[PDB]
Amino acid sequence: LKITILAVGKLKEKYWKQAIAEYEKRLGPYTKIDIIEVPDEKAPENMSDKEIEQVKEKEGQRILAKIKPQSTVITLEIQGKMLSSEGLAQELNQRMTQGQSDFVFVIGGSNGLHKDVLQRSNYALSFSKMTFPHQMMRVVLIEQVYRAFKIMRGEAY
């Protein structure tokens, strides 16, 4: 029913923007798909832990302001549950079955997600043990959402 990608920062790369548009169109038919960006908190690149946390907290409070309290919140965390593609199809399916229709997948900025955003999570999803830049993570995520729908639908892909 509703699929939201709530991410930090914009995409300034045209190839990433073109890729997201492709998947957005492929997902259309299966679900409403929405992409919401919240501004990243502009800061130096070298920072104390103190400053790191302040940047996360500003980003996090804007992420949290966008999340309705009834939403199924899925946070992308390298330390979360590592689902196979079928494991994600099974996970989303089961939720839809049991009444959930509003899914918000969150992607943090360059310094990750604040613990507040992490405590709101309904499910921590890991895509890898490696670090993927947040702009490329957005492409990888939406392709993966399109894949899970195909799998939930028993469609070849």
XYZ file of C-alpha atoms in Angstrom:
157
model
C 0.000 0.000 0.000
C 2.479 2.751 0.966
C 6.275 2.581 0.711
C 8.327 5.521 1.925
C 12.076 6.066 1.544
C 13.038 8.691 4.181
C 16.646 9.647 3.563
C 19.119 12.277 4.655
C 20.569 14.704 2.113
C 19.902 15.221 -1.575
C 21.376 13.308 -4.519
C 23.541 15.638 -6.635
C 24.588 12.870 -8.992
C 22.491 12.515 -12.151
C 23.222 8.759 -12.463
C 21.815 8.082 -8.990
C 18.789 10.273 -9.721
C 18.226 8.448 -13.006
C 18.524 5.091 -11.285
C 16.027 5.987 -8.532
C 13.546 7.188 -11.169
C 13.768 3.847 -13.005
C 12.940 1.782 -9.914
C 10.281 4.286 -8.775
C 8.489 3.691 -12.100
C 8.954 -0.079 -11.777
C 7.483 -0.019 -8.248
C 4.542 2.223 -9.192
C 2.284 -0.622 -10.310
C 2.837 -2.527 -7.092
C 2.567 0.151 -4.403
C 2.490 3.906 -3.824
C 6.211 4.782 -3.529
C 7.356 7.983 -1.955
C 10.766 9.493 -1.473
C 11.255 12.121 1.247
C 14.578 13.839 1.926
C 15.456 15.699 5.097
C 18.310 18.195 4.998
C 21.679 16.929 6.171
C 23.267 19.046 8.935
C 26.092 20.880 7.171
C 29.380 20.522 9.043
C 33.136 20.019 8.827
C 34.293 16.572 7.697
C 36.696 16.138 10.531
C 34.739 16.296 13.803
C 34.904 15.484 17.472
C 32.508 12.760 18.663
C 30.654 15.555 20.406
C 30.087 17.335 17.096
C 29.360 14.031 15.328
C 26.501 13.439 17.781
C 25.151 16.960 17.354
C 24.995 16.510 13.595
C 23.144 13.155 14.055
C 20.719 14.577 16.590
C 19.757 17.458 14.310
C 19.303 15.074 11.431
C 17.489 12.587 13.620
C 14.988 15.040 15.032
C 14.047 16.027 11.458
C 13.737 12.344 10.462
C 11.555 11.683 13.489
C 9.377 14.677 12.768
C 8.500 13.062 9.475
C 7.526 9.687 10.879
C 3.871 9.208 11.847
C 3.457 7.226 15.030
C 1.479 4.448 13.345
C 4.185 3.769 10.723
C 6.171 0.599 10.287
C 9.706 1.978 10.585
C 12.539 0.051 9.035
C 15.989 1.462 9.705
C 18.976 0.600 7.510
C 21.771 -0.258 9.932
C 24.925 -2.221 9.132
C 24.463 -4.018 12.450
C 20.800 -5.059 11.954
C 19.118 -8.256 10.738
C 20.746 -9.618 7.572
C 17.862 -10.841 5.469
C 18.245 -12.691 2.171
C 16.076 -11.202 -0.592
C 13.443 -13.896 0.097
C 13.730 -13.200 3.864
C 12.757 -9.537 3.156
C 9.869 -10.605 0.882
C 8.703 -12.947 3.659
C 9.140 -10.217 6.283
C 7.198 -7.548 4.359
C 4.552 -10.046 3.261
C 3.879 -11.232 6.811
C 3.487 -7.637 7.983
C 1.044 -6.737 5.198
C -0.856 -9.924 5.944
C -1.116 -8.864 9.573
C -2.502 -5.383 8.864
C 0.467 -3.103 8.291
C 0.320 -0.965 5.151
C 2.584 1.985 5.880
C 6.282 1.221 5.670
C 8.984 3.788 6.151
C 12.537 2.727 5.326
C 15.055 5.200 6.766
C 18.549 6.033 5.569
C 20.816 8.275 7.667
C 23.398 10.793 6.480
C 27.195 10.555 6.391
C 27.506 10.035 10.147
C 24.789 7.400 10.490
C 21.562 7.595 12.527
C 21.125 9.094 15.986
C 20.027 6.687 18.737
C 16.577 8.371 18.916
C 15.871 7.311 15.327
C 17.241 3.870 16.243
C 14.820 3.589 19.233
C 11.851 4.415 17.020
C 12.780 1.534 14.732
C 10.345 -1.340 14.306
C 13.006 -3.327 12.481
C 16.733 -2.834 11.875
C 17.597 -4.129 8.403
C 21.200 -4.742 7.393
C 22.070 -4.893 3.661
C 25.768 -5.577 4.263
C 28.623 -5.635 6.744
C 30.333 -3.168 4.430
C 29.706 0.577 4.313
C 27.767 1.930 1.372
C 27.674 5.682 0.743
C 24.147 6.946 1.557
C 23.415 8.130 -2.024
C 24.197 4.679 -3.470
C 22.369 3.039 -0.566
C 19.186 4.773 -1.787
C 19.529 3.123 -5.208
C 20.343 -0.257 -3.719
C 17.325 -0.035 -1.316
C 14.634 0.821 -3.845
C 15.949 -1.872 -6.189
C 15.645 -4.253 -3.298
C 12.067 -3.117 -2.528
C 11.129 -3.702 -6.179
C 12.748 -7.124 -5.888
C 10.776 -8.074 -2.755
C 7.474 -7.179 -4.450
C 8.436 -9.341 -7.441
C 9.164 -12.204 -5.032
C 5.954 -11.584 -3.056
C 4.146 -11.685 -6.385
C 5.809 -14.886 -7.632
C 7.093 -12.923 -10.661
C 10.318 -13.837 -12.494
C 13.116 -11.327 -11.794
